[PDB]
Write a protein that binds this ligand. Structure first.
Ligand SMILES: Nc1nc(=O)c2c([nH]1)NC[C@@H](CNc1ccc(C(=O)N[C@@H](CCC(=O)O)C(=O)O)cc1)N2C=O
Ligand SMILES: O=c1ccn([C@@H]2O[C@H](COP(=O)(O)O)[C@@H](O)[C@H]2O)c(=O)[nH]1
Length: 298
């Protein structure tokens, strides 16, 4: 079974590895220009031609892919929609690996959004690729738990592990044409967009648990959840929830050692953070750096 693969980052690398282990012949990999593994370096080491056009949806790339005669196409965290002109070239179709429990969390950054939203489970889905992103029939799915202390990077690794398992289990079935698919239930679908560093703003009126989830969702090496002291941005890199009710106004500094901020329900301890583009520091030092005192209002 011959394939053309669209791949990026760690999911891209493990998808390529899984295909090679399952005995697929990879004729070409399409990727993007740049902590993640490099699909291009993997392709190069494996002797596979690799290409990173900004937009693969060009007549000449369509023609080129056609000339490679793929049986099947895979996408493993390729970022750009691939037009029907390309997808229809492969007689056995096209499959994508998405990092959520479709039909929930279609779209961008499902790793981060499930954390933002306080989910206790997520998963990986392999589905047929169709014109609408993340919307085609499901062929395999694997559910995993999100632990209360998971952060983006730790959940990322768990999703990668799950993807490897799912692919190892499923790729042989595709190769042999055993491949039941079930349509997604559109009434159950949810979809999320690209996140910017700004979508990680901490709003202190929210429950401490919700703010904690935001901190986890974009913890290092993601860009971090943030607030301000006047013109001074600061990032909360790690936190802990103090569930006890405070009579303090949301955003009030309850204490500076440890740095504890009243929320809409409970309080949030800022365990580590940074002021602006300065270095990471413990919360008590951050408090001093920012000029906060007990009773300061954020
Ligand atoms: N045909 C096809 N189907 C897919 O499911 C699929 C591909 N291609 N290619 C790789 C990838 C692309 N996934 C996505 C996911 C979301 C958007 C999206 O919502 N785009 C918005 C907003 C701008 C943006 O985020 O790019 C839009 O209005 O198009 C696009 C592509 N993908 C499966 O992962
Ligand atoms: O919750 C998120 C998820 C991603 N990004 C940004 O989205 C881009 C895509 O990230 P990759 O998807 O991590 O490249 C990067 O600039 C990344 O920092 C955020 O700001 N917040």
């Amino acid at each position: 079974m011959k394939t053309v693969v669209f791949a990026y980052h760690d999911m891209g690398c493990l998808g390529i590895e899984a295909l090679l282990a399952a005995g697929y012949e990879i004729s070409a990999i399409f990727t993007h220009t740049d902590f993640y593994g490099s699909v291009a370096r993997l392709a190069a080491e494996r002797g596979i031609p690799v290409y990173a056009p900004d937009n693969v949806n060009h007549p000449l790339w369509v023609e080129r892919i056609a000339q490679l005669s793929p049986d099947v196409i895979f996408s493993f965290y390729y970022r750009h929609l691939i037009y029907d002109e390309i997808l229809q070239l492969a007689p056995a179709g096209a499959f994508n690996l998405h990092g959520s429990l479709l039909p929930k969390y279609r779209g961008r950054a499902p790793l981060n959004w499930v954390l933002v939203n306080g989910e206790t489970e997520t998963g990986v889905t392999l589905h047929r690729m169709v014109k609408r992103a993340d919307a085609g029939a499901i062929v395999a799915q694997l559910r995993i738990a999100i632990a209360p202390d998971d952060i983006a990077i730790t959940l990322h690794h768990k999703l990668c592990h799950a993807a490897r398992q799912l692919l190892e289990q499923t790729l042989p079935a595709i190769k042999h044409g055993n491949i039941l698919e079930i349509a997604q239930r559109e009434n159950e679908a949810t979809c999320f967009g690209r996140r910017t560093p700004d979508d990680s703003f901490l709003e202190w009126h929210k429950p401490a648990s919700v703010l904690h989830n935001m901190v986890r969702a974009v913890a290092d090496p993601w860009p971090g959840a943030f607030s301000y002291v006047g013109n001074q941005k600061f990032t909360v890199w790690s936190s802990r929830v103090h569930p006890h009710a405070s009579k303090a106004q949301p955003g009030s500094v309850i204490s500076v050692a440890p740095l504890l901020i009243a929320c809409g329900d409970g309080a949030l301890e800022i365990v580590t953070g940074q002021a602006g583009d300065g270095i990471t520091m413990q919360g008590s030092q951050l408090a001093q750096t920012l000029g906060l005192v007990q009773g300061s209002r954020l």
